[PDB]
């Protein structure tokens, strides 16, 4: 899915509007990109599929409280 | 006509009497096919009595305390080894 497991960010059903007010659908979805972030409780890289807001959490708050906030780490 | 003796008989003679009444039921099927004079009421109370026998045996399965599927595995674990034997009425 296009969801981030740490922070529950999903896609956004948000129309796009032209100049003559014509509206298509344009399902708008997050930049949850592949990374491989270091883990201090095992001193090792984990391969994750992280949104950039969740990236700012795991660098700001640390991966332990964010991963226990989501509930999953392995 | 009360079947008071069935809760007096132990489990081995209970089960042997089940097998004897089933064999006598097969003899009633052969005598029904042979068109010899037979009692259909005995064909009724034969199977109908085996129902009594297996209710008493199943209550004895209940008061020990075991599951329904344990009675499936125990009953089908017994039914796999039944050597056919003719009844003692000869």
């Amino acid at each position: 899915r296009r969801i981030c497991p740490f922070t529950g960010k999903k896609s956004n059903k948000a129309n796009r509007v032209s100049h003559s007010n014509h509206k298509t659908k344009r399902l708008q979805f997050v930049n949850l990109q592949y990374k491989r972030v270091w883990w201090e409780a095992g001193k090792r890289f984990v391969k994750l599929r992280l949104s950039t807001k969740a990236l700012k959490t795991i660098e700001k708050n640390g991966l332990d409280a964010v991963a226990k906030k989501a509930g999953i780490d392995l | 006509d009360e079947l008071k003796e069935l809760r007096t008989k132990t489990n081995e003679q209970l089960n042997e009497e089940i097998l004897q009444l089933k064999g006598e039921l097969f003899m009633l099927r052969l005598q029904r096919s042979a068109r010899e004079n037979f009692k259909p009421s005995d064909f009724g109370r034969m199977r109908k009595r085996v129902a009594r026998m297996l209710t008493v045996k199943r209550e004895r399965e209940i008061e020990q305390g075991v599951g329904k599927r344990l009675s499936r595995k125990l009953d089908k674990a017994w039914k796999r080894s039944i050597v056919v034997r003719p009844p003692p009425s000869l």
Partner: protein, 92 residues
């Protein structure tokens, strides 16, 4: 352990003989006799339920299905046992 293919209530594996004239032809001409059995039956379960309840060595067990559903079994006994002396005892 020696399992059969299916555990099938062995005191009900046979249902009824067949009293047609061709069955008496199989008795007098084949040393065989005719039974009606249920569909869930074998050439190993019927063959054991003849050498025990009757007391006769059975030679072969030729089975067939009948399109009304039920199964028909031609059982041929051994040469040592006449089917006529063992069929009048039952009522054929």
């Amino acid at each position: 352990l020696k399992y059969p293919r299916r555990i099938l209530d062995v005191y009900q594996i046979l249902q009824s003989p067949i009293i047609t004239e061709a069955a008496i032809k199989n008795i007098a001409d084949e040393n065989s006799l005719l039974f009606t059995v249920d569909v869930r039956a074998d050439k190993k379960m019927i063959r054991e339920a003849i050498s025990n309840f009757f007391g006769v060595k059975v030679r072969k067990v030729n089975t067939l299905i009948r399109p009304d559903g039920t199964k028909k079994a031609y059982i041929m006994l051994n040469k040592e046992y006449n089917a006529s002396e063992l069929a009048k005892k039952i009522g054929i």
